[PDB]
Amino acid sequence: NSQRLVFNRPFLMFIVDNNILFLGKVNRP
Amino acid sequence: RRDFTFDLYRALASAAPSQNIFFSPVSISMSLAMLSLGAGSSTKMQILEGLGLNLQKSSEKELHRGFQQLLQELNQPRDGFQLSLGNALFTDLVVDLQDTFVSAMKTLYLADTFPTNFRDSAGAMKQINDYVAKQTKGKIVDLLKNLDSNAVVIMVNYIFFKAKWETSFNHKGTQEQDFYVTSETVVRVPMMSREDQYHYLLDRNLSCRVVGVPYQGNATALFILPSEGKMQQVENGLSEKTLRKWLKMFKKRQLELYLPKFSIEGSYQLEKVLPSLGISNVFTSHADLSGISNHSNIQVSEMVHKAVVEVDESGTRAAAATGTIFTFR
Ligand SMILES: *[C@@H]1O[C@H](CO)[C@@H](O[C@@H]2O[C@H](CO)[C@@H](O)[C@H](O)[C@H]2NC(C)=O)[C@H](O)[C@H]1NC(C)=O
Ligand SMILES: *[C@H]1O[C@H](CO)[C@@H](O[C@H]2O[C@H](CO)[C@@H](O)[C@H](O)[C@H]2NC(C)=O)[C@H](O)[C@H]1NC(C)=O
User: Glycosylation positions (chain B)?
Assistant: First the structure.
């Protein structure tokens, strides 16, 4: 199958290493 | 027994309701852990507590050994991947810092030490901002705005990250597509796409879907899409435990991913939000920073943080800086 996943609403972002490097919310591109 | 990273995340969100948020926990927490190095009494305790230090399981020194390890495990700009973390001390020409503080800063944190003439505010800002800018490859330009005159020392931390995706996005596969800030406020954004195998995850409790998109190197981006009307819910459910749970819950799945190409940033005066995490004293004239200097008085005027991120079809670019300013009066 091929599930669809479209980020078209606010969404969180994590940039993980072994630790959490960056974290934020994209409320509006 | 506290999630500093997510407690801080919520604090920042609550202060800026429906606006973008972005910061570097490692930058701030490392900065805090450095600050605690020359802290005493209850002030030195609010910081450790605010970080979620066990006082038993984890013992202060384990905290430093950890960050030390982190700083040491850093590699040179590999190919298509780079992560660098640095710390710097800017000391006034006419002030002395305790040997212990300076020593720990150089040993555990590999901190640079630059003599600074704080009597010339403009010059001090240029020196420091130029350094931060330099270290973040021009991504963080004006960290300090109006450096106080009583400024006698500034502790700086920066973080720089650049990496290409493990698999890029087809540049020609990007189309202008609608983005719903709210069901009624919609704006067009360049929407990236790529069908492939991704580490998927469906958290029915927090009510959101999580995708893992790896980088050429060690760093994965996690994009959380809360179900319609639940952003607030998942934000509240964010925790160190949740991240762990999410991590092994991850199973690869055939996905046709649509991600918007974006860029955001955040600027925060941390001295204003940290007392929400119980870190208040150190920011007052009631502070105990006797571990940093003997000509005591000094407190933390402000703790400015700045972070930026760029996300396109090639990869991601992110950096941030934390400036801890110590004043006399
Ligand atoms: C991040 O990169 C480092 C250094 O390149 C990795 O360290 C080892 O790298 C070799 C390279 O072939 C792997 O075979 C080892 O398995 C790696 N050891 C581990 C698991 O640390 C490191 O693996 C990468 N990220 C991680 C998981 O730490
Ligand atoms: C979210 O919470 C629910 C409970 O509300 C979890 O449901 C079960 O999860 C585990 C596997 O069955 C058990 O260890 C839990 O005890 C059980 N819940 C209970 C108490 O009934 C669910 O797994 C959780 N999922 C995530 C990803 O957080």
Answer: 205, 218, 294
Ligand 2 in reach of B208 Cβ (< 6 A): no
> Does the CB of B293 have a partner CB in chain A at under 8 Å?
no
Stated resolution in angstroms: 2.4
Q: Are B133 and B190 members of one domain?
A: no
Same domain? B29 vs B158: yes
Q: B153: distance to nearest CA of chain A, Å?
A: 26
Which H or E element spans position B295?
A: none
B223: its two tokens: 């994009």
Range of the domain at B276: 1-164+260-313
Whether B179 and B289 map to the same domain: the answer is no
Residue in B177, B187, B221 closest to A15 by CB: B221
**Nearest residue of B to residue A8, measured between CA atoms:** B179
With CA atoms as reference, report the closest residue to B94 among B151, B39, B144, B35. B151
**Cβ B205 under 6 angstroms from ligand 2:** yes
Q: How many domains does chain B have?
A: 2
- The secondary structure of B80-108 as a DSSP string is SEEEEEEEEEEEETT--B-HHHHHHHHHH
Instruction: Please report, in angstroms and rounded to a whole number, the separation of the first and last CA atoms in chain B.
Output: 34
B272-280: Cβ within 8 A, 24+ apart: B273/B8, B273/B11, B273/B12, B273/B15, B274/B8, B274/B50, B274/B303, B276/B7, B276/B11, B277/B2, B277/B4, B277/B7, B277/B8, B277/B11, B277/B50, B278/B46, B278/B49, B278/B50, B279/B32, B279/B46, B279/B47, B279/B50, B280/B46
Phi, psi of B39 (to 5 degrees): -115, 150
